[PDB]
Design a protein around this ligand. Sequence first.
Ligand code: L18
Ligand code: L18
Ligand code: PLP
Ligand code: PLP
Lengths: 435, 435
Amino acid sequence: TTPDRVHEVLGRSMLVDGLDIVLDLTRSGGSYLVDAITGRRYLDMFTFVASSALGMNPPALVDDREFHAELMQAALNKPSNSDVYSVAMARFVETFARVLGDPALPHLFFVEGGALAVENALKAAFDWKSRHNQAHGIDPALGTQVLHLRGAFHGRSGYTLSLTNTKPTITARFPKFDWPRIDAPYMRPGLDEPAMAALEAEALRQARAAFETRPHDIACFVAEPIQGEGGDRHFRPEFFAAMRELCDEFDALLIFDEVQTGCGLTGTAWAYQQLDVAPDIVAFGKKTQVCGVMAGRRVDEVADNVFAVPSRLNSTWGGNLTDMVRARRILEVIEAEGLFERAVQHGKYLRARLDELAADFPAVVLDPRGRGLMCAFSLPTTADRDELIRQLWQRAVIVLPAGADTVRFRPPLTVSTAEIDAAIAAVRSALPVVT
Amino acid sequence: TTPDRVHEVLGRSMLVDGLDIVLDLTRSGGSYLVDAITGRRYLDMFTFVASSALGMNPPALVDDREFHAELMQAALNKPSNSDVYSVAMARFVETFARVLGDPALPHLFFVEGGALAVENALKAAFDWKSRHNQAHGIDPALGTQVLHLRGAFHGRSGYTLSLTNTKPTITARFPKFDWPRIDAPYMRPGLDEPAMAALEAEALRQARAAFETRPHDIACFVAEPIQGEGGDRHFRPEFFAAMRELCDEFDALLIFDEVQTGCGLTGTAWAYQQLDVAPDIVAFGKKTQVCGVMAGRRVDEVADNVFAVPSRLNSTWGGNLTDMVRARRILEVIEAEGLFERAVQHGKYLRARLDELAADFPAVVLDPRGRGLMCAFSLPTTADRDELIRQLWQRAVIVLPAGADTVRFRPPLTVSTAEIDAAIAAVRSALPVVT
Ligand SMILES: C[C@H](C[C@@H]1CCCCN1C)C[C@@H](C)c1ccccc1
Ligand SMILES: C[C@H](C[C@@H]1CCCCN1C)C[C@@H](C)c1ccccc1
Ligand SMILES: *Cc1c(COP(=O)(O)O)cnc(C)c1O
Ligand SMILES: *Cc1c(COP(=O)(O)O)cnc(C)c1O
């Protein structure tokens, strides 16, 4: 089977709506994807939907002969890590704890897939609330609802389908629990301190109303610290701090879904570390390769919680061992090469460039925003947004859309300023064409 | 980190309730797991919860130098297969279609995890029923319920938590949809043709009652063709044939969950092929490494179904590319070495041995049963079952429990008769000790 026949073969069995290229697995590297049909190189601001930390074939992985043998040992088989342990697994777990761990959140759980990571966070919370209720004289049948935001994206699985509300395509015709949803008080351009504070008070009022009308029945509040798929919507630390206090008031856990914000993209291990809010549970995925949760804080107040009692949480595999081995090497590179700090520095550079774009194209490049390497801007209409993406594709720059009118940048942590300049140069080229 | 410190390290972060061994990734092979602490070899009738087709480090994979390079290419990165295609992916898809495909079920979809494979089958069905309703003058808000069996195990995710009903530990304190559940008319010892037929009529009556009291609202019937975790419970082809007809009568899809029965274990690619019942959707996982669904039959009667319309089903990764590359090699070995037929022959041998056990230990070894290599027997009490498992562990034979009093055998397809004899010899040793 030849590169030029890939779309043909796949097309017999599946819907083929992805990119026009065929990925060259060997010749792609760093911030470039190589199309195996033409050999054209594509500048990557997309990173497998923000799931690659270092880009393709990073040198510290490719040149590492000891690592090759470790990866191969892992890749040949697929053990059930949930009941068969190995040195390979333990090395990953201890380096995850070292590089990404939070002392307040010592309980780790691993699974394949981001939706299921969020779900295990939720299951942790339902169990917690039911047992916390029970211990305090309240009916243990209560504690089954999840407070969440408009524009949230948490996945496409049984539970997360009740939370996700972006495109109706994702959720239409699928059965949902009726869980309380509140407005998202995200930063928008041209709203000052008190204008922002008023918008937050309104979400807080909605959250508080939800807590009082479903007493003892809300198990947790879930949020993306920055909403990704919904359109790169950022929130002031003030909002989550108030939510944190409101959650404690009503004995409900605070879960951050860091599947997209996690693993150094915003400049720190986790976005919540910059918002100065302590969560009880963190769901991770994408760049971590293996997905899962970190839990602690109030979770430990219930002694027979989901992390202390056998067989409450499980999967056949407990995550992919190959993902585990790759991820620990990735983490070791992040740690040794200072890549969180590099994301801070380079994220400031990218942001500055988008501010310059906004100045030169004031009615077109709207609302430049970002935290670390997680950056975006908006266009006036969705037709303009889609056209800008097509135009960038023709210039061999891969970016992702989000929401109705956002273009998001998701470079690897290893992106250089020259690579950023080239991405920006391509946007300057395409803009007069869209206007 | 050393083999003897694995349990210590893991224990700081997670609950450590798996096996006492540390898996030697390199020295394990075929039907033997090697403990890296002592070097003791363990006879494997467990196969990573039935998820390994060929056992550890199969020679056709280990000695294949071209395959090594392909695996390594795949293992170094983790592309989003859902939007970035590759030769590696297309080779897997076409060999899956060739070795395991069904002409009636041409739509393939891939995901990480068995629970999510079942869920995508369900989502396919909810969508189908809503659109089929709509096209026939019925409210499209109807079609949200799943008919299913007692003792069923379909996973631990949002939707499958409403279906799974084995141990209360798996499902307690988690929110569920109230979906119709019916009795499971499995074969039990000492019930003849009419006794069996009466028991089936009763489940059929319950199924029919469910259809008539929730009109147009049941989207599908799900079943394991042989119930695994619930205790290796087999059903006569007569039962599923009648269910097939009843499903057509009420315009509902028939989904087989073949995550455990699939990929040659019962002697054929799929168990349903031996029961002579055509499903509309098949969910697969475990031995396939990548999980997912095959769909067709009545699914194609709705032209804008989930397989024809973009973005209705998705995940970030669309399955693990490393799993895809490994699995196609596994499939090529199954095909070239005639391993389905070998499962038929060796499964007959194992069954015969369990019949001999039943004859020599008539009050202890109860209800020997199997299809292909999927075999089991029961003890009088669960205390006896647990003791037999402990005793076998001491003799270095790994088997799994199921249900209240079942011991299940899950050998690789490559098991030899000598290996079976050794497993049986160990059971004969342990039995007088348990009695
Ligand atoms: C591991 C358990 C099965 C369970 C635990 C080990 C021994 C006996 N079983 C009750 C279920 C597993 C297949 C799963 C996980 C996540 C989503 C879906 C499904
Ligand atoms: C791939 C989509 C996201 C979606 C499709 C591609 C472009 C824009 N998005 C609306 C959701 C995905 C993260 C997922 C899958 C399975 C379970 C949970 C979550
Ligand atoms: C294994 C199993 C599943 C769930 O698989 P996971 O990969 O652990 O999520 C679903 N159905 C059946 C019949 C199973 O054996
Ligand atoms: C990616 C995403 C998920 C779902 O991840 P999958 O691996 O595709 O299931 C959940 N939450 C957020 C915020 C995401 O970005």
